[PDB]
Design an enzyme around this catalytic site. Structure first.
Site, PDB file in Angstrom:
ATOM      1  N   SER A 243      68.404  53.122   1.808  1.00 33.25           N
ATOM      2  CA  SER A 243      68.426  54.603   2.551  1.00 33.25           C
ATOM      3  C   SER A 243      69.714  54.848   3.280  1.00 33.25           C
ATOM      4  CB  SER A 243      67.256  54.653   3.677  1.00 33.25           C
ATOM      5  OG  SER A 243      67.113  53.689   4.552  1.00 33.25           O
ATOM      6  N   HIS A 273      62.171  48.470  -0.262  1.00 30.97           N
ATOM      7  CA  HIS A 273      62.629  49.106   0.912  1.00 30.97           C
ATOM      8  C   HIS A 273      61.669  49.349   2.064  1.00 30.97           C
ATOM      9  CE1 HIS A 273      65.866  50.294   3.696  1.00 30.97           C
ATOM     10  NE2 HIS A 273      66.189  51.516   3.006  1.00 30.97           N
ATOM     11  N   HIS A 316      65.148  39.121   2.862  1.00 32.76           N
ATOM     12  CA  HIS A 316      65.947  40.202   3.097  1.00 32.76           C
ATOM     13  C   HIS A 316      67.383  40.170   2.387  1.00 32.76           C
ATOM     14  CE1 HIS A 316      68.531  42.755   5.756  1.00 32.76           C
ATOM     15  NE2 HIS A 316      67.315  43.270   5.805  1.00 32.76           N
ATOM     16  N   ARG A 325      63.730  42.284  14.766  1.00 29.11           N
ATOM     17  CA  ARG A 325      62.959  43.260  14.768  1.00 29.11           C
ATOM     18  C   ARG A 325      61.737  43.004  14.839  1.00 29.11           C
ATOM     19  NH1 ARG A 325      65.489  47.310  10.538  1.00 29.11           N
ATOM     20  NH2 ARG A 325      65.409  45.173   9.245  1.00 29.11           N
ATOM     21  N   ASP A 371      59.138  44.935   8.203  1.00 30.07           N
ATOM     22  CA  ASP A 371      58.172  45.514   7.599  1.00 30.07           C
ATOM     23  C   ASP A 371      56.698  44.365   7.767  1.00 30.07           C
ATOM     24  OD1 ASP A 371      59.944  47.062   5.253  1.00 30.07           O
ATOM     25  OD2 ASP A 371      59.490  47.842   7.215  1.00 30.07           O
ATOM     26  N   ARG A 397      64.734  56.319  11.247  1.00 32.36           N
ATOM     27  CA  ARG A 397      66.123  56.108  10.265  1.00 32.36           C
ATOM     28  C   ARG A 397      66.912  57.386  10.297  1.00 32.36           C
ATOM     29  NH1 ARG A 397      67.481  51.690   7.333  1.00 32.36           N
ATOM     30  NH2 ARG A 397      66.555  50.744   9.466  1.00 32.36           N
ATOM     31  N   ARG A 417      83.116  56.733  -4.771  1.00 30.08           N
ATOM     32  CA  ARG A 417      83.258  56.604  -6.545  1.00 30.08           C
ATOM     33  C   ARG A 417      83.723  55.626  -7.001  1.00 30.08           C
ATOM     34  NH1 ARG A 417      83.184  56.104 -11.785  1.00 30.08           N
ATOM     35  NH2 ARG A 417      82.820  58.092 -12.863  1.00 30.08           N
TER      36      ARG A 417
HETATM   37  C1  LIG Z   1      64.200  42.335   0.599  1.00 29.68           C
HETATM   38  C2  LIG Z   1      64.537  41.724  -0.846  1.00 29.68           C
HETATM   39  C3  LIG Z   1      64.483  42.949  -1.669  1.00 29.68           C
HETATM   40  C4  LIG Z   1      66.110  41.099  -0.942  1.00 29.68           C
HETATM   41  O1  LIG Z   1      66.083  41.048  -2.293  1.00 29.68           O
HETATM   42  P1  LIG Z   1      67.342  39.863  -2.789  1.00 29.68           P
HETATM   43  O2  LIG Z   1      68.519  39.938  -1.998  1.00 29.68           O
HETATM   44  O3  LIG Z   1      67.785  40.227  -4.294  1.00 29.68           O
HETATM   45  O4  LIG Z   1      66.327  38.475  -2.615  1.00 29.68           O
HETATM   46  P2  LIG Z   1      66.841  37.031  -2.855  1.00 29.68           P
HETATM   47  O5  LIG Z   1      68.292  36.833  -2.887  1.00 29.68           O
HETATM   48  O6  LIG Z   1      66.131  36.123  -1.761  1.00 29.68           O
HETATM   49  O7  LIG Z   1      66.078  37.044  -4.195  1.00 29.68           O
HETATM   50  C5  LIG Z   1      66.243  35.538  -5.157  1.00 29.68           C
HETATM   51  C6  LIG Z   1      64.793  35.678  -5.753  1.00 29.68           C
HETATM   52  O8  LIG Z   1      63.675  35.555  -4.886  1.00 29.68           O
HETATM   53  C7  LIG Z   1      62.842  36.585  -5.010  1.00 29.68           C
HETATM   54  N1  LIG Z   1      62.310  36.553  -3.619  1.00 29.68           N
HETATM   55  C8  LIG Z   1      62.860  37.397  -2.625  1.00 29.68           C
HETATM   56  N2  LIG Z   1      61.873  37.707  -1.695  1.00 29.68           N
HETATM   57  C9  LIG Z   1      60.628  37.385  -2.146  1.00 29.68           C
HETATM   58  C10 LIG Z   1      59.396  37.994  -1.693  1.00 29.68           C
HETATM   59  N3  LIG Z   1      59.111  38.530  -0.594  1.00 29.68           N
HETATM   60  N4  LIG Z   1      58.149  37.520  -2.386  1.00 29.68           N
HETATM   61  C11 LIG Z   1      58.498  36.821  -3.486  1.00 29.68           C
HETATM   62  N5  LIG Z   1      59.699  36.644  -4.179  1.00 29.68           N
HETATM   63  C12 LIG Z   1      60.795  36.915  -3.607  1.00 29.68           C
HETATM   64  C13 LIG Z   1      63.684  37.664  -5.506  1.00 29.68           C
HETATM   65  O9  LIG Z   1      62.930  38.880  -5.900  1.00 29.68           O
HETATM   66  C14 LIG Z   1      64.327  36.689  -6.694  1.00 29.68           C
HETATM   67  O10 LIG Z   1      63.579  36.591  -7.858  1.00 29.68           O
HETATM   68  P3  LIG Z   1      64.266  36.707  -9.411  1.00 29.68           P
HETATM   69  O11 LIG Z   1      65.758  36.071  -9.539  1.00 29.68           O
HETATM   70  O12 LIG Z   1      63.116  36.549 -10.760  1.00 29.68           O
HETATM   71  O13 LIG Z   1      64.367  38.486  -9.596  1.00 29.68           O
HETATM   72  C15 LIG Z   1      63.512  40.680  -1.299  1.00 29.68           C
HETATM   73  O14 LIG Z   1      63.500  39.456  -0.279  1.00 29.68           O
HETATM   74  C16 LIG Z   1      62.139  41.017  -1.536  1.00 29.68           C
HETATM   75  O15 LIG Z   1      61.793  41.678  -2.520  1.00 29.68           O
HETATM   76  N6  LIG Z   1      61.046  41.287  -0.371  1.00 29.68           N
HETATM   77  C17 LIG Z   1      59.813  41.621  -0.674  1.00 29.68           C
HETATM   78  C18 LIG Z   1      59.961  43.395  -0.363  1.00 29.68           C
HETATM   79  C19 LIG Z   1      60.441  43.456   1.141  1.00 29.68           C
HETATM   80  O16 LIG Z   1      59.612  42.811   2.154  1.00 29.68           O
HETATM   81  N7  LIG Z   1      60.999  44.152   1.363  1.00 29.68           N
HETATM   82  C20 LIG Z   1      61.768  44.773   2.997  1.00 29.68           C
HETATM   83  C21 LIG Z   1      63.105  44.427   3.097  1.00 29.68           C
HETATM   84  S1  LIG Z   1      63.659  44.535   4.879  1.00 29.68           S
HETATM   85  C22 LIG Z   1      63.311  45.878   5.701  1.00 29.68           C
HETATM   86  C23 LIG Z   1      63.354  47.188   5.011  1.00 29.68           C
HETATM   87  O17 LIG Z   1      64.272  47.165   4.092  1.00 29.68           O
HETATM   88  O18 LIG Z   1      62.254  48.217   4.832  1.00 29.68           O
HETATM   89  O1  LIG Z   2      69.265  45.928   5.767  1.00 25.67           O
HETATM   90  C1  LIG Z   2      68.251  46.361   4.634  1.00 25.67           C
HETATM   91  O2  LIG Z   2      68.723  45.968   3.378  1.00 25.67           O
HETATM   92  C2  LIG Z   2      66.877  46.621   4.701  1.00 25.67           C
HETATM   93  C3  LIG Z   2      66.436  46.785   6.153  1.00 25.67           C
HETATM   94  O3  LIG Z   2      66.298  45.743   6.857  1.00 25.67           O
HETATM   95  C4  LIG Z   2      66.470  48.223   6.880  1.00 25.67           C
HETATM   96  O4  LIG Z   2      67.185  48.886   6.395  1.00 25.67           O
HETATM   97  O5  LIG Z   2      65.778  48.389   7.860  1.00 25.67           O
HETATM   98  O1  LIG Z   3      82.958  60.617 -12.890  1.00 28.67           O
HETATM   99  C1  LIG Z   3      82.688  61.345 -11.798  1.00 28.67           C
HETATM  100  O2  LIG Z   3      82.889  60.737 -10.535  1.00 28.67           O
HETATM  101  C2  LIG Z   3      81.903  62.795 -11.860  1.00 28.67           C
HETATM  102  C3  LIG Z   3      82.160  63.449 -13.211  1.00 28.67           C
HETATM  103  O3  LIG Z   3      83.044  63.811 -13.791  1.00 28.67           O
HETATM  104  C4  LIG Z   3      80.535  63.616 -13.614  1.00 28.67           C
HETATM  105  O4  LIG Z   3      79.767  62.878 -12.972  1.00 28.67           O
HETATM  106  O5  LIG Z   3      80.312  64.192 -14.828  1.00 28.67           O
END
Ligand SMILES: CC(C)(COP(=O)(O)OP(=O)(O)OC[C@H]1O[C@@H](n2cnc3c(N)ncnc32)[C@H](O)[C@@H]1OP(=O)(O)O)[C@@H](O)C(=O)NCCC(=O)NCCSCC(=O)O
Ligand SMILES: O=C([O-])CC(=O)C(=O)O
Ligand SMILES: O=C([O-])CC(=O)C(=O)O
Ligand SMILES: CC(C)(COP(=O)(O)OP(=O)(O)OC[C@H]1O[C@@H](n2cnc3c(N)ncnc32)[C@H](O)[C@@H]1OP(=O)(O)O)[C@@H](O)C(=O)NCCC(=O)NCCSCC(=O)O
Lengths: 429, 429
Positions: A243, A273, A316, A325, A371, A397, A417
């Site tokens: 976000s 997210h 995360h 949090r 969350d 946010r 960019r």
């Molecule tokens: C928050 C995340 C997206 C971070 O993603 P990332 O940095 O790519 O995670 P990672 O490096 O631990 O991923 C390695 C592997 O573990 C998997 N993994 C990580 N978290 C989870 C989870 N909660 N459940 C199951 N699998 C998971 C991940 O998806 C991946 O699988 P593959 O390689 O086949 O795609 C992830 O942990 C997730 O999907 N969590 C569940 C959704 C969630 O609770 N999101 C909120 C995030 S924090 C607050 C906010 O942003 O609102």
């Molecule tokens: O830091 C992140 O990637 C997601 C998160 O916890 C937030 O945006 O509040």
């Molecule tokens: O490439 C860029 O940064 C912008 C541009 O020309 C397009 O998105 O068409």
């Protein structure tokens, strides 16, 4: 002579920083801060130092800092309504300025945000005609986009102002947008869940959170405290999160603050997210459907995992420890709603999930994030409409993303960019 | 046995690529592709290799490539309506698949996009109530956000599908979204500029561009050719551009294709990005107000520069030469509207601007980009409502961003989440 004005403070602050970043760069712009690997490119920039974002910094172990202010520090240092939780108003000052506001500064934000809170007719109309199957986040995002009609920045730009003054109009539109947010959000709330009722008036004499809860229709004195805490902690989470990054990216092209915030929301609405909010409750809600044993609790977790799904509220991108949090929230529950069975389930899960996640060997961070704990708090107070939770996240946010947005433009940050590559091209590199 | 189906082709293609990226990574993921400097961080990722994006690659000197297909190659290789310009349908196939489609493939996209083009009641309603001072881009963006109601991906996700199948639902929602786009865009057009008139029906037997121009109300046979070219060339411009990058970022969080496209639009709406469209004409429009001399033409340019404003339609983050999209357009004007005084002014500016920009010594690329040439073309054919031009850009851009979006999800690209830093923290590093 005179009294309180954030804009004047900023006017004093901008040139100094400007100066400060110039020399730094004059000496160190050439300095290699890191390298980029193939995995990083395929990996969502994981581990790449990509942006400057000043309002907050995330430490992988310690977690989020507002100046260099942790959550517990905020909790003690920021002014309160009377009466134990920090006012998001104060957080906002902190973020913008780098300093801890006085009660009196804080009152000023309150009044200011109360003065500015007004919704244009076309917006009210659109919200009133929206279908009830249109998600609250969608409703929110379209509403804020539609508000750009009123953009002070979009208008000044069209007029041809000098770049140098951008920040000034950004600031106005940010303050205005923050002011309106609760009205928009409550109107969605009221339409979907309280058909026929009205959000009522904003009372200049209350804090932003309290006006919000009134517009939401909640009277519980503890609900109000919960709100203040919630909107404060959800503020900001550094620049790299989906976000904030989206706002940053869109803002860089000089789309006004309304447009950039709305795009940010489309990002917060994603399941990985902010929508996690909602996903957590829905999953708890299913869990219970199907007072359980750790073993049956564990079976449930595996089945989600085995199904190619994520366990919401755990993991995360950056954190490597339990999110402060989350702790923050737990500590609130322990005080206020310790016997709540939903709460108890969430406490129980904390004992199981990470262990199951460690067992599975995929998650790099097996601990809960914000969350995993937020919905349980809401549900207790009567706010049980889960598809709405992300809206609240959305409102909070705005505080961090708009606070930075003003700085970006003050500092003259250019178009974001980066260079992209295809697999064939990388293959060839 | 059987006939044409993009999805089946994709089904065949996905595993191979999957396989191909895995080994590559197994061998080279550790490989340093570049370094990150302080200036890069402050500089909008300028020069940073940050993303993989497969549909198109931008060369700083040569300009955009579709496979490795340049614009002139596209122009000769892609099927045409009968009858000289390439059908954006074919471009779409090209982008998705990597291959040059046959006329028959192309017809299939046409019919498919005609079958899918239908607007839900709530959307029509909202568009009909929008104020006329609400910008067309805002109108567009809120409309596409409001369409998420209908998301096939958002629905499957909610149902708990296995990650593995994501691409499948993304594809459906992309095809649907592309199909609807012209209806939404034309409805805005008709409401704002042709009050009381109706967009009419889509005819399955026409190409997407022609149905669009009909809905827009244009009959000129050359206008249709212009449209096809326009929507093709505006397609995609690699991954790093604000709009594509935004879609990519938002999509990574698993927000559906509607939400991600809409955020992309909030990005395209910025003056430094697509809105340049519009900004160019407005500036030409002012220029003329105030058959001029190069010297008076030059005075005009300086005054914009001296005022802290940009000369719209000139410069580029990545390009270092005249944009082939500009040449492409010029070559169309030279054929079709060579005596047009607006055209002549744009030709004259090409002789002056870059020289003035070289003189000033700030722009790293002093040459024109696509936006410097597009409006003049539109105005000639009668489409003189400049605030609308970016909408057209918007419609085209869906082609590249959605084509990639499908791949991201097919390839299982994760959350985009880079690390950010504050100045104090960098200062300390
Ligand atoms: C928050 C995340 C997206 C971070 O993603 P990332 O940095 O790519 O995670 P990672 O490096 O631990 O991923 C390695 C592997 O573990 C998997 N993994 C990580 N978290 C989870 C989870 N909660 N459940 C199951 N699998 C998971 C991940 O998806 C991946 O699988 P593959 O390689 O086949 O795609 C992830 O942990 C997730 O999907 N969590 C569940 C959704 C969630 O609770 N999101 C909120 C995030 S924090 C607050 C906010 O942003 O609102
Ligand atoms: O830091 C992140 O990637 C997601 C998160 O916890 C937030 O945006 O509040
Ligand atoms: O490439 C860029 O940064 C912008 C541009 O020309 C397009 O998105 O068409
Ligand atoms: C397209 C750009 C944003 C690229 O930005 P960048 O990579 O940061 O540019 P750069 O590296 O040449 O910038 C160095 C300096 O020259 C300035 N400069 C660059 N282009 C221009 C321009 N057309 N007019 C005046 N100054 C300019 C630039 O703003 C900066 O000034 P300062 O250091 O005080 O901020 C820029 O050239 C610009 O603002 N152009 C005018 C708007 C425009 O036509 N945008 C369309 C871009 S391409 C197609 C599309 O995206 O729709």
């Amino acid at each position: 002579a005179s009294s309180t004005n954030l804009k004047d403070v900023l006017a004093a602050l901008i040139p100094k920083e400007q100066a400060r970043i110039k020399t730094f760069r004059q000496q160190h712009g050439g300095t290699a801060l890191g390298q980029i690997t193939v995995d990083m490119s395929y990996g969502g920039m994981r581990g790449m130092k990509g942006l400057v974002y000043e309002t907050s910094v995330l430490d992988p172990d310690e977690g989020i800092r507002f100046r260099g202010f942790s959550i517990p520090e905020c909790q003690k240092l920021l002014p309160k309504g009377g009466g134990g939780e920090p006012l998001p108003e104060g957080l906002f000052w902190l973020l913008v300025t780098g300093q801890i506001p006085t009660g009196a500064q804080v009152s000023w934000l309150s009044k200011e945000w109360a003065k500015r809170a007004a919704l244009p007719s076309h917006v009210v109309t659109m919200l009133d005609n929206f279908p009830t199957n249109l998600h609250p986040m969608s409703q929110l995002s379209a509403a804020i986009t539609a508000l750009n009609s009123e953009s002070n920045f979009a208008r000044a730009y069209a007029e041809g102002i000098l770049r140098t003054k951008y920040w000034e109009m950004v600031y106005e539109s940010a303050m205005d947008l923050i002011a309106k947010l609760p009205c928009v959000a409550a109107k969605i709330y009221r339409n979907l869940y309280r058909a026929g009722s009205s959000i009522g008036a904003i009372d200049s004499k209350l804090d932003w959170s309290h006006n919000f809860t009134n517009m939401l229709g909640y009277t519980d004195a503890q609900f109000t405290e919960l709100m203040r805490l919630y909107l404060t902690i959800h503020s900001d989470h550094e620049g790299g999160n989906v976000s904030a990054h989206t706002s940053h990216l869109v803002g860089s092209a000089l789309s006004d603050p309304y447009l950039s915030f709305a795009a940010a929301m489309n990002g917060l609405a994603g399941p990985l997210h902010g929508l996690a909010n909602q996903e957590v409750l829905g999953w708890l809600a299913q869990l219970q459907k199907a007072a359980g044993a750790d073993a049956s609790l564990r079976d449930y977790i595996w089945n989600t995992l085995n199904s190619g799904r994520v366990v919401p509220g755990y993991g995360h991108a950056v954190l490597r420890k339990t999110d402060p949090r989350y702790t923050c929230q737990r500590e609130f529950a322990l005080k206020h709603l310790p016997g709540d069975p939903m709460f108890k389930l969430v406490a129980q899960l904390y004992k199981i999930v990470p262990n199951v996640l460690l067992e599975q060997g995929a998650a790099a961070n097996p601990w809960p994030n914000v969350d995993a704990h937020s919905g349980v708090l809401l549900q207790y107070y009567g706010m049980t409409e889960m598809n709405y939770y992300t809206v609240l996240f959305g409102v909070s946010r705005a505080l961090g993303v708009l606070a930075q947005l003003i700085w970006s433009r003050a500092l003259g940050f250019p178009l974001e960019r980066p260079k992209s590559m295809s697999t064939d091209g990388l293959i060839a590199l």
